[PDB]
Amino acid sequence: MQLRFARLSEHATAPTRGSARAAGYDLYSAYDYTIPPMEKAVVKTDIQIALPSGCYGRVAPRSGLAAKHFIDVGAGVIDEDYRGNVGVVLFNFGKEKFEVKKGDRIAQLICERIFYPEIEEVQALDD
Amino acid sequence: MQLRFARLSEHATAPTRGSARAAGYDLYSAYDYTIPPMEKAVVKTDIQIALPSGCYGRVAPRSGLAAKHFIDVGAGVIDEDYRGNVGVVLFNFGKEKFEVKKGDRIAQLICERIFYPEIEEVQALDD
Amino acid sequence: MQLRFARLSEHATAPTRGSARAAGYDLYSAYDYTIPPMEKAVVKTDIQIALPSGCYGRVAPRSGLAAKHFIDVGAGVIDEDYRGNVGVVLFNFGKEKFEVKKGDRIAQLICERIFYPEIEEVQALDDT
Amino acid sequence: AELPTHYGTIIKTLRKYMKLTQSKLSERTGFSQNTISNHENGNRNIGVNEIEIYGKGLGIPSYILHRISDEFKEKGYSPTLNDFGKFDKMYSYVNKAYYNDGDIYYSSYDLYDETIKLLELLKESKINVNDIDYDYVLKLYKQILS
Amino acid sequence: AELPTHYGTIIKTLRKYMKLTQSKLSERTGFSQNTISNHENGNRNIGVNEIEIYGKGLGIPSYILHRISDEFKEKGYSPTLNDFGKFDKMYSYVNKAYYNDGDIYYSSYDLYDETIKLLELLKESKINVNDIDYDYVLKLYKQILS
Amino acid sequence: AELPTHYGTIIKTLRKYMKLTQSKLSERTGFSQNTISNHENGNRNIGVNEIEIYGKGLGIPSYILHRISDEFKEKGYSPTLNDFGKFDKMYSYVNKAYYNDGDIYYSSYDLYDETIKLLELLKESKINVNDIDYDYVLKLYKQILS
Ligand SMILES: [Mg+2]
Numbered sequence: 026m027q028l029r030f031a032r033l034s035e036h037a038t039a040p041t042r043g044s045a046r047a048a049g050y051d052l053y054s055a056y057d058y059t060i061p062p063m064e065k066a067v068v069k070t071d072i073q074i075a076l077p078s079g080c081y082g083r084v085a086p087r088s089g090l091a092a093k094h095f096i097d098v099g100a101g102v103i104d105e106d107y108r109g110n111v112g113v114v115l116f117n118f119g120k121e122k123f124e125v126k127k128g129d130r131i132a133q134l135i136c137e138r139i140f141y142p143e144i145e146e147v148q149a150l151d152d
Numbered sequence: 153m154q155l156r157f158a159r160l161s162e163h164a165t166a167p168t169r170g171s172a173r174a175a176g177y178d179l180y181s182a183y184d185y186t187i188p189p190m191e192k193a194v195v196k197t198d199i200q201i202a203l204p205s206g207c208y209g210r211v212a213p214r215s216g217l218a219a220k221h222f223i224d225v226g227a228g229v230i231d232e233d234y235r236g237n238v239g240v241v242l243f244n245f246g247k248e249k250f251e252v253k254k255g256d257r258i259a260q261l262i263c264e265r266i267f268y269p270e271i272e273e274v275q276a277l278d279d
Numbered sequence: 280m281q282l283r284f285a286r287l288s289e290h291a292t293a294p295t296r297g298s299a300r301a302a303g304y305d306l307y308s309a310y311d312y313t314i315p316p317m318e319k320a321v322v323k324t325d326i327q328i329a330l331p332s333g334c335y336g337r338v339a340p341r342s343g344l345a346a347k348h349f350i351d352v353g354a355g356v357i358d359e360d361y362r363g364n365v366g367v368v369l370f371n372f373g374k375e376k377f378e379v380k381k382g383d384r385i386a387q388l389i390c391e392r393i394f395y396p397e398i399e400e401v402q403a404l405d406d407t
Numbered sequence: 408a409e410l411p412t413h414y415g416t417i418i419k420t421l422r423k424y425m426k427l428t429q430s431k432l433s434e435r436t437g438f439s440q441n442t443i444s445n446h447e448n449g450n451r452n453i454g455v456n457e458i459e460i461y462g463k464g465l466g467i468p469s470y471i472l473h474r475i476s477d478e479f480k481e482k483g484y485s486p487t488l489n490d491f492g493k494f495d496k497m498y499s500y501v502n503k504a505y506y507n508d509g510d511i512y513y514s515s516y517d518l519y520d521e522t523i524k525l526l527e528l529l530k531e532s533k534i535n536v537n538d539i540d541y542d543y544v545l546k547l548y549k550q551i552l553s
Numbered sequence: 554a555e556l557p558t559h560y561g562t563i564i565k566t567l568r569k570y571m572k573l574t575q576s577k578l579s580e581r582t583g584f585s586q587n588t589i590s591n592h593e594n595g596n597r598n599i600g601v602n603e604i605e606i607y608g609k610g611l612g613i614p615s616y617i618l619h620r621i622s623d624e625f626k627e628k629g630y631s632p633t634l635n636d637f638g639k640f641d642k643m644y645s646y647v648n649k650a651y652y653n654d655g656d657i658y659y660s661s662y663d664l665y666d667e668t669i670k671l672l673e674l675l676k677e678s679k680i681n682v683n684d685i686d687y688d689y690v691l692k693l694y695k696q697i698l699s
Numbered sequence: 700a701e702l703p704t705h706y707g708t709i710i711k712t713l714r715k716y717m718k719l720t721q722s723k724l725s726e727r728t729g730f731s732q733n734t735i736s737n738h739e740n741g742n743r744n745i746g747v748n749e750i751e752i753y754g755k756g757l758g759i760p761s762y763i764l765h766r767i768s769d770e771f772k773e774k775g776y777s778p779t780l781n782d783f784g785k786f787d788k789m790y791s792y793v794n795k796a797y798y799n800d801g802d803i804y805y806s807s808y809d810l811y812d813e814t815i816k817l818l819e820l821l822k823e824s825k826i827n828v829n830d831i832d833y834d835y836v837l838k839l840y841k842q843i844l845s
Contacts, residue, residue: 406503406507
């Protein structure tokens with residue numbers, strides 16, 4: 026399948042991908058946020074997604090923001106059925122504040138392929 | 153695909169999954185822990201697992217704990233052959249203390265599908 | 280398939296993997312670094328990689344460094360086409376300083392299998 | 408180790424609640440009606456891995472059957488299983504809300520408890536469960552998460 | 554629900570820039586030659602998802618077509634589309650640099666703007682583009698990222 | 700570029716340690732028994748990537764063969780390759796311990812060095828390696844990681 030999305034507001038940017046073989050689609054903030062040092066923000070994108078089958082959506086860090094402004098992405102598991110507003114949990118681990126403006130790139134969305142396995146209890150497992 | 157597990161003590165909860173298409177199985181603590189602010193704990197689950205072949209187990213963060221209490225998951229690669237006690241390395245980056253009680257949900261276990269490729273040195277790679 | 284790499288300098292160690300079914304290849308630093316507490320360093324490996332098709336490279340944490348010295352790995356997405364020097368963005372969240380010596384293992388490289396899907400905008404999606 | 412006997416009561420009550428016969432459940436689970444009987448009637452104990460099958464057979468997430476058992480292990484009885492209709496109704500809103508609203512999705516800790524908190528807040532406000540709708544329950548849900 | 558008209562002009566100009574005939578693009582994208590003509594001539598508006606097709610047909614990242622449109626929505630015209638050759642030249646250096654040099658890969662924010670910053674820095678220094686090489690541009694690029 | 704000559708000595712010693720003949724190695728993971736003999740005799744150098752093949756053939760993780768070479772590059776000889784039996788015994792405990800115990804799994808840095816540290820700790824305590832059991836070595840192992 027494909028990655029279907031839908032704008033939830035006037036303020037959302039469509040996810041973009043630069044190369045044909047780039048790991049993730051870029052996610053853009055829909056609002057202005059000021060994250061204090063050593064603090065966290067749930068940045069809303071105002072888009073809803075439906076991931077292709079056989080994968081979940083990993084909200085992954087941008088290497089730029091990480092190496093230069095000490096920005097990580099907390100949480101970041103998007104379920105196959107999550108149909109609400111995709112949010113990006115940003116951790117600012119820097120000494121200064123970090124400034125999110127609408128239309129800024131703050132993460133990428135990778136379609137991590139996973140199994141959906143059946144759980145089965147046993148007495149013990151052979152070491 | 154099946155995910156066989158085994159209880160290592162009376163104190164372990166069986167891994168649970170809400171939806172049939174949810175990204176990971178919930179992992180529950182087996183003990184009480186108090187993680188001071190800006191500190192870390194290896195939370196034992198008292199379960200051992202055997203993952204389906206062609207994947208590893210990623211101990212991923214819960215979106216709630218991350219957005220509201222600034223809780224991340226350090227480390228988190230579970231090898232295919234790891235047969236010991238699945239532990240979850242928790243980072244408390246918040247300003248307050250964070251309280252883990254037995255039976256709390258502290259992570260999810262995703263079966264990330266990966267390749268196991270053979271390594272091959274070259275003089276250089278064509279860009 | 281195969282994971283081709285190439286040394287970019289005299290100082291690089293070839294990626295190694297312990298078990299035949301281990302999740303990632305070990306990545307070794309090519310230099311000494313002293314990371315202050317609550318600070319970060321992009322540890323250069325002086326190797327370039329080309330990943331097998333249908334996956335990207337995740338630079339993932341080593342469980343030891345994380346549980347014992349509070350060391351996390353920032354960033355860590357290596358695109359299929361990245362042909363430059365593989366670097367590992369190390370976060371030292373400990374109270375002391377952390378010491379990277381040349382030839383130290385500082386991360387692992389997992390071949391995360393992913394889709395490369397085509398995007399398609401819709402008016403709205405039927406809610407679950 | 409095998410499972411407590413009250414899982415028989417739990418499976419039995421919920422069978423009668425989903426208007427399912429032992430024969431219909433026998434087709435879904437694959438167990439003989441005799442096996443289901445001795446399980447429900449308390450004669451033999453249900454294996455750890457058989458509850459997952461029953462959950463599919465009954466169409467109730469096996470996750471929930473244990474949370475009901477947890478109420479037997481503590482209170483002696485299960486108030487959720489007692490008035491399970493009000494629970495099934497609320498849980499489905501709590502679920503829908505979790506998978507469709509970001510405030511809930513990035514804030515919920517455990518849907519099961521949140522459903523109970525919601526049913527207790529409705530009893531405290533003297534409001535029936537089949538009198539409120541998904542949109543109203545969401546407003547309430549969002550308050551209890553801050 | 555449809556896209557502005559200027560996407561026709563954009564597709565048209567860039568078609569003429571990649572020295573591609575309407576018939577050649579008709580097989581590259583899969584749109585009938587009439588569809589492309591009414592699209593380029595401003596007669597019918599391009600669907601939201603058809604631009605990705607055009608980008609592949611043209612061999613220009615669809616990500617870029619929108620960044621050009623962003624310039625029409627603001628300035629009224631598009632200076633990038635005006636002197637698109639100097640852009641394509643620089644963008645290909647910026648790209649090569651991002652995908653082959655670690656300082657750029659672990660530092661770049663958005664390749665499009667960085668290309669524009671670089672073209673504006675060369676205009677301020679009165680240097681033509683066919684006087685600089687990849688190695689000269691890289692040195693400059695690395696400075697503008699600190 | 701080809702690999703140092705001592706990899707021949709390493710391949711030879713480890714062949715005799717796994718009771719494997721040159722023709723057996725050619726049938727397991729080799730091109731010709733004559734090629735393998737000229738590599739071991741030092742007349743031909745093993746290619747950079749041929750070591751991985753040899754490792755599977757011998758049934759020793761190729762990761763370890765290079766760590767032995769590292770000891771030639773420094774010490775001039777390889778004491779590990781000298782008394783490799785005591786190593787193989789300890790390594791197999793270290794491995795089992797790493798993959799089965801959380802304290803080891805979430806604390807180890809490098810299995811190879813840890814095996815050497817452990818063999819050196821037994822030499823300091825004058826304890827034979829074929830006299831201690833897996834459970835004894837684990838107790839020591841966890842100490843050397845604290
Ligand atoms: Mg993290």
